[PDB]
């Protein structure tokens, strides 16, 4: 998208979201990142929404195909098509990880931006881990863990316990522990401690911030209800 103005790419990403054209939205935001300037808070959300929706559709398709393939293992076409979807998903995750490494993370100095990008890095390694097998699974799992852990360390030092990015990071790291790392007790402990420390800080918030924080706290509670 090298010939399109940065501001036009941002405008078109917002239009693509309204039109539910998430592949277009992600291509516009990739072009905006590749202009080389840092992203504002709103622009970071556009980037994350676009890729989360693209890879979320790929993950849902991979899960459908993987279930069919497992049932048939109780011609080569189901495996071949699952592999095609899997390769496409891996390619999108590699694209997002490449944007983060060249050069969003290294230029992000404020806590809000650095935590946001490291949470993304943990998420896209987690999506790679969902489809990985064997020893390659191990190194991919550790890369997700390391990204989430650095984000957690910064968030605990620099953000209040109700900050929505801090809360969403803790939510997704808890899902990592439960679904990827085979650590359900760590998942439950992290979700409970996060919820309780946020509850104790709600008194400091305005009505609008209260709504944002309580919405994510309810997601933590929904997981705790499913896990206990």
């Amino acid at each position: 998208m090298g010939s399109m103005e940065r501001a036009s790419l941002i405008q078109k990403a917002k239009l693509a979201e309204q039109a539910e054209r998430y592949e277009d939205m992600a291509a516009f935001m990739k072009g905006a990142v590749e202009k080389g300037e840092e992203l504002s808070c709103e622009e970071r959300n556009l980037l994350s929404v676009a890729y989360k929706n693209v890879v979320g559709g790929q993950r849902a398709a991979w899960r459908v195909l993987s279930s069919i393939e497992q049932k048939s293992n109780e011609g080569p076409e189901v495996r071949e098509y699952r592999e095609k979807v899997e390769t496409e998903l891996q390619g999108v995750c590699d694209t997002v990880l490449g944007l983060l490494d060249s050069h969003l993370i290294k230029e992000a100095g404020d806590a809000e931006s650095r935590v946001f990008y490291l949470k993304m890095k943990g998420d896209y390694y987690r999506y790679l881990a969902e489809v990985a097998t064997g020893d390659d699974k191990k190194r991919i799992i550790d890369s997700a863990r390391s990204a989430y852990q650095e984000a957690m360390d910064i968030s605990k030092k620099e953000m209040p316990p109700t900050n929505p990015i801090r809360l969403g990071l803790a939510l997704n790291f808890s899902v990592f522990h439960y679904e990827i790392a085979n650590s359900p007790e760590e998942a439950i402990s992290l979700a409970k401690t996060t919820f309780d420390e946020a509850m104790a800080d709600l008194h400091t918030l305005s009505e609008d911030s209260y709504k944002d924080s309580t919405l994510i706290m309810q997601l933590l509670r929904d997981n705790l209800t499913l896990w206990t």
Binding site: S48, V49, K52, L171, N172, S174, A187, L219, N223, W227
Partner: peptide
Amino acid sequence: AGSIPGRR
């Protein structure tokens, strides 16, 4: 188990 959605 659910992770965070993209938008509120």
